[PDB]
Write a protein that binds this ligand. Structure first.
Ligand SMILES: Nc1ncnc2c1ncn2[C@@H]1O[C@H](COP(=O)(O)OP(=O)(O)NP(=O)(O)O)[C@@H](O)[C@H]1O
Ligand SMILES: Nc1ncnc2c1ncn2[C@@H]1O[C@H](COP(=O)(O)OP(=O)(O)NP(=O)(O)O)[C@@H](O)[C@H]1O
Ligand SMILES: Nc1ncnc2c1ncn2[C@@H]1O[C@H](COP(=O)(O)OP(=O)(O)NP(=O)(O)O)[C@@H](O)[C@H]1O
Ligand SMILES: Nc1ncnc2c1ncn2[C@@H]1O[C@H](COP(=O)(O)OP(=O)(O)NP(=O)(O)O)[C@@H](O)[C@H]1O
Ligand SMILES: Nc1ncnc2c1ncn2[C@@H]1O[C@H](COP(=O)(O)OP(=O)(O)NP(=O)(O)O)[C@@H](O)[C@H]1O
Ligand SMILES: [Mg+2]
Ligand SMILES: [Mg+2]
Ligand SMILES: [Mg+2]
Lengths: 362, 362, 362, 362, 362
DNA sequence: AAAAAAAAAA
DNA sequence: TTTTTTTTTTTTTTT
């Protein structure tokens, strides 16, 4: 009998696997019998125990075949092909709704009876993260609105601020919440081709700590960063399609994703400042440092970096009327699940702990 | 039963897919039965609902295929072969007619019964642009004739005037209607050689924001860009063939594309002045400034800077006999729509409001 | 009869063979008859004599084959796929526990009765290593804990000090203890793209003897390494995923590993200093140099830079409760071996000999 | 009948071809009828006449074959695979013992009755080389131990001195004796990567005539070589595994070979000097110049550059006990041959001839 | 009936064709019937009419092939394989003797009845060349000896002298006589790798007009050549195998070819001067310029640049016994032909004519 | 352009 | 399953 390539493509789509070697490794683990399988008995990874019995028969034949990597390439290209169809067809609010919906599935396994997370720790993160900027919850709502409306020229946000000031923590959470990629532009411009190529079919890009000019008086080293961005004006404004190249593939023409530039106290050119909508001035808070020092779990579990933490903040602070209609049915359940867990009293006490630089949970 | 590669090539040709994964992705959507598929029921995307019912039977056999990427590569290379044949063998009248009737297809999508756009805003965009210059439709129509005839020396147009005079808006609108790209001759003469390579196989080029030399006596930032351009005599004149150098690729010979120079009120050396057939003095108009602050939706959906807005202006103002004989039958239909949806009093009232600095569309 | 590709994949898996030429070379040694093989008779290498008798039948058919490198590539792909599955599925503590089990297997062979190694020479290395830094067992345990707790921005350690101070020595031992790659950032920034790709799925990276600027008056040659490390700040932070590259494979997107920077008294930017949670100042001790001159086996057998020396140090100094549950079984066995072989009296004489700068075995 | 791919691989293994075109070329010579063949009648090249009679039947079928370069590729990859297995599995003294067996096999051809070479001329080369440095045979043995022990940081020797001092002469001899590659690090840092990949799986490297800076006070032109080496001090240490790159292949992680740096009286950094365990100061000797111009056969036959001359120096000067057990049998036999053909009176007169500047054979 | 790949390989080997497209083109024009072939009737190119009548049958089948470049690639790789075998296994005197035979074959064609050359014009070249430099035939014979012997560091010659002194005239003639290529070391140093890769498997190189610095006080342009050449000391030495690089190909290890350096009167560093054996001072001679102005056929037919003019000079002036014994047979019949057509008094009149700037043939 | 890695033919 | 044909990148160029 012969390997069904469709079952492998179905598994790859079901688990959304776009790495050929991960797909090979995952599928090969199905060749052992399910009735004696320790991974299915422990229920470690859902990407195994859901699929093993279904794919066992195909995986035994797959394990004997001579072109295993060809089978996996096609399945991976099917997943990359669906992403390109979705990227070119879907309305941009449906992109964010699909990303929210994926986070909400991922949340339900995190905090479930088979879970391994404490909502009180993650809500202590929400409280800490809301302290970082004045009216952070409203600021995240009009950031999300900005990225959905994607108005040409008026597409990008600038996060300036000192060393250890929280711009990479917020940008990392917004990156996870909106579902983007982080890009490095401090390299020479002709290495930048394939790196800009990673923005292909993504929703946000974050340009992480772009280095400027004139920083030497402040011990801030100079680099190619600002000069690359100020050449890439064709990409930031989105007025036209620019062409993104990636291996084994034709160069996609697309309007480059919107997003976030994160920057230290470099001077920014007048030509470049014209293309950022809003500048958030991050600055270090004395109390927040002591709060984390007395609350190690925030950093160890990466709570303050997480889009799940910012999503929990949007459950708490914004009306249900703001969410997409197909997901409102999930949002109102998670509303009552936070209402049934945190009183406004405990939240205000733990937020006050942050403001005092006391341990948030005290 | 066999997969017909001819049917995939036929879908690719009708849809004009350059991209292997986009073609792979969309063709795999047809594998599901048309009897109940929601994308056909909803009729959201024409690239699916028009084609699924005839490609279903081939898509079922394609979805089982082991060759899938190879099939799509041949189908893509057929569409690229068609482009290279047309690029060498079409006349410029046909090249513009193909971009026009492509835009008429986009208009038929935007303003259809399943539409997503309202013509009242677009006609307000027409009225705004039309007020920007005296006899704007003649300016646009005569520019199109220049680009279509590509007459040596009578080949480039100069846009100059104060800061925020609209020069770059009209250049951006003309770029989409004709097809073309923006070039930056302000560069040092070293980098200019790779910058000019952008012009290969473009129908049109715009020189953006030429920073002239002598004008800083009235605080125009001094630059070399005008004297760089003055040296490029054979690129402007379009008599002889020039050698154009994309970085990492070997030099192509062609007649350099026609174009627009967008400039501030700098002094021009007389031999560079002789190479522009028309100089248009853009000037800032207070009532246009007030109207933009009041009709502000035009800037958000970017109607003001689109080729379809200029094509709507040509359909409104110009007689059908000026359009290419094969597109005339579609211009007939679009004139009747634009008349029946807008009595002249409505457009006149809009143009009056714009002239009065009143943003309301009435 | 035909070659079993499955058996080659089993050999590659059991040998954990990443290299196609190493797999080809080793499997071809099995084509000879095991009844007379000198390497089975002599038991020189375990990757031969454990496996030859099983694989002889298959290897004789493989030796006639025309596919040979294709067979080995699929087997190597299976080993790499297992590494990517484990990388994404396993906890970082289980990764470290698996590495310690690997070293204990190797220690059991190495210090067996067949073993070539003398435990008294290796504990003399543990004595020398413990004299390098104050509280080195605490420093080693703190480092392991820091690499397992992949805490964002608190990920990297800086080793600073003069020539022959012990930075590379300890880094090379920690590199073998945890598993990882040494990267050279002193080379120019364009081909640095493929160096950083060597960190794909690794547990640590060590940035080795990176070169700064200034300090030429101290007779330190300047170089790019620190400026290159002040780029790539997002690789050091690990708050965000970064895109890593192998030839002909597509980009892999992951959090870049934690680890160590070693440098020779250059001026670190404050931007880069903020990425390092600990700076260890290494300091030349003449008694350690004189000890090595009189206990040369430490250098010749590479004892003082081996991960097995640091593991023996942790087995000596740390309580069993600090090791993971799986390996505690094996570590009580190694503790009772060391306490049988060494009383504390032999070891305290070794440390006295090291502090005296005489031969450690005197 | 079909071509045996095995016999081509067996030839490649016996003749040790790294090169696909050399293997193809050699094997196609075996097409022609063995009985008549002029190369076997002359016995000109041993890689022909030892193998043609055996391979003729296979080579006739190979010459009709349609995939010849594919056959030779697998044969070459088998030879490269054995070379990688040997590099990882052999002790470093076994490696040198193998190389000595290969040189002794070449000496058995050179000085047998078929051989083109006169040992009287080669022993006059031993006489000339022994006069170059004090206690040269001790220096050669000390170098061989250093390369065999491969002690971290104690691995590189520096050869230093003026024009025509003898550095490249002794470096080329030691390179042939031990086996290895010479590298030009004077070429710029961006081409340097593929140069260093020539050291993959080699026993020595020689960094030939590297250029420093600040030599114009001596008319020594400055260059990049010493600054390039100091960027590679990670590679000279040999504590950690460096990642080596040859075109299209992914990086191989190995310990960089031990070796020699030869340089002409430039100043060397302290950081780089710490990587050199011994510095040999070469002084030019007037009598060696006058000896060579009257002993021209030494330069024409490349005798003083040869590893066979250094091996004859070790056979003459070193005790039998210093050679590896396996070759002591052959070394005893070669000692008896040299004592038979050379009295000590002939040899000590040769050294007297060298010191007087007389022709060695007078 | 099938295409014989063997007959295509015979044709390639008999033509010595190593260009795949040239082989494809040459073999395809055999597909037309021999009996009416206009190229055979006109005897235009010898590579056709000799081979067409035997290859027609196979070329007809080759025309219907689907794999034509695959066939040609194997035939080209066979010719490259023979060149590489001959490169490693021929003695250099045989290599030169092969080249002289190839030149004598060209001479037979040029001066035979089907030819197009008059020996009196070519012997006027010999007279002109012998007047260029004192004892010119000894100089050429000494150069041939130098290139055949290839003595390390005693194997490059320096041609030095002012503008228009004969340097490139003689160097080009010597380069056609011996075979080899010219190199332009004046490039920027990063392009230099692919210049030097031109020397792979070559017999000579000529470094053409290397430019130094500090000739500007004598109106010589400065350049990078001499400094680049001093980075390549180990290439000029020829003691060690250097690593040579063609584009997209891995590094060949070989001893770099011996050769000539040609330069204007720049000052040479002693490190580079020590690599040259003989410096030949070329001077402008009034009588050679006046003579060429009258005897223009020497320039117009490229006679004085040609190795065939130098080979005739060796046939005239040198004893038969200096030629390798294989070619002595052809050299004696060429001496007899030259003694026939030239009296010594005709040649002495030519030398006397050129000594006075009268036309050689007057 | 040439090779290394990958896919189609019979 | 045996054997031959195909895609694609890297490299190079660029900085
Ligand atoms: N505003 C803040 N005040 C005090 N501590 C903070 C603040 N924001 C973040 N932190 C701490 O700083 C660490 C790093 O935050 P991060 O987002 O990387 O700062 P940053 O502004 O990006 N620094 P940099 O990347 O160097 O410009 C976090 O892990 C917190 O421990
Ligand atoms: N006539 C106008 N007067 C004032 N503002 C205008 C006018 N036309 C467009 N704008 C606004 O200015 C921007 C577009 O003008 P733009 O085309 O860039 O002018 P320009 O002549 O290119 N300016 P500059 O780049 O300074 O030479 C948008 O924000 C418009 O809302
Ligand atoms: N603290 C120490 N005191 C004295 N000798 C030492 C010390 N540490 C190491 N050594 C010796 O120095 C050699 C190299 O140590 P290593 O760790 O490479 O130094 P380092 O700090 O990296 N110096 P460098 O790499 O040149 O900046 C070892 O092989 C020992 O012989
Ligand atoms: N010690 C010596 N005294 C005199 N002549 C020597 C000596 N050593 C070598 N030679 C001669 O010099 C030639 C080149 O020797 P070589 O080893 O290349 O010199 P070197 O030290 O490398 N000089 P350089 O490479 O220019 O810095 C040999 O072929 C001998 O003819
Ligand atoms: N010795 C000579 N005296 C006078 N004229 C000569 C001499 N040799 C050559 N010529 C003429 O000069 C031309 C150029 O000779 P060529 O050998 O190319 O000169 P060169 O020295 O190589 N030039 P350059 O490389 O620029 O310094 C020849 O074609 C002759 O016409
Ligand atoms: Mg170090
Ligand atoms: Mg030298
Ligand atoms: Mg010249």
């Amino acid at each position: 009998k012969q390997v069904s390539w469709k079952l492998v493509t179905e598994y790859a789509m079901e688990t959304k696997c776009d790495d050929v070697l991960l797909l090979l490794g995952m599928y090969l683990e199905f060749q052992y019998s399910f009735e004696m399988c320790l991974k299915c008995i422990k229920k470690e990874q859902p990407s195994h125990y859901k699929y093993h019995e279904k794919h066992y028969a195909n995986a035994a034949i797959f394990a004997d075949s001579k072109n295993q990597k060809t089978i996996c390439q096609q399945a991976v290209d099917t997943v990359l092909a669906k992403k390109r169809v979705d990227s070119l067809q879907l309305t941009r609010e449906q992109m964010l709704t699909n990303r929210f919906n994926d986070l909400l599935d991922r949340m339900d396994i995190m905090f479930g009876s088979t879970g391994s997370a404490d909502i009180e720790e993650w809500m202590a993160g929400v409280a800490w993260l809301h302290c970082l900027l004045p009216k952070m919850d409203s600021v995240v709502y009009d950031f999300l609105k900005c990225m959905v409306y994607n108005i040409p020229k008026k597409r990008y946000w600038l996060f300036k601020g000192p060393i250890d000031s929280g711009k990479t923590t917020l940008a990392a959470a917004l990156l996870e919440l909106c579902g983007g990629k982080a890009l490095n532009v401090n390299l020479p411009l002709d290495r930048l081709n394939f790196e800009l190529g990673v923005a292909i079919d993504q929703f946000l890009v974050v340009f992480e700590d772009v280095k400027g000019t004139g920083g030497e008086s402040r011990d801030l080293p100079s680099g190619q960063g600002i000069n690359n961005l100020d050449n890439l004006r064709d990409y930031l404004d989105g007025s036209v399609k620019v062409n993104l190249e990636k291996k084994h593939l034709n160069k996609r023409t697309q309007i480059f994703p919107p997003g976030i530039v994160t920057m230290n106290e470099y001077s920014v050119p007048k030509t470049l400042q014209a293309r950022f909508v809003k500048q958030i001035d991050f600055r270090p808070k004395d109390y927040l440092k002591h709060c984390l020092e007395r609350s190690e779990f925030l950093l160890e579990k990466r709570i303050i970096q997480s889009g799940i933490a910012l999503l929990l903040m949007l459950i708490w602070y914004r009306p249900v009327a703001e969410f997409a209609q197909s997901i409102q049915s999930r949002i109102v359940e998670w509303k009552e699940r936070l209402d049934k867990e945190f009183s406004l009293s405990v939240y205000q006490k733990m937020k006050f702990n942050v403001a005092m630089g006391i341990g948030v949970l005290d």
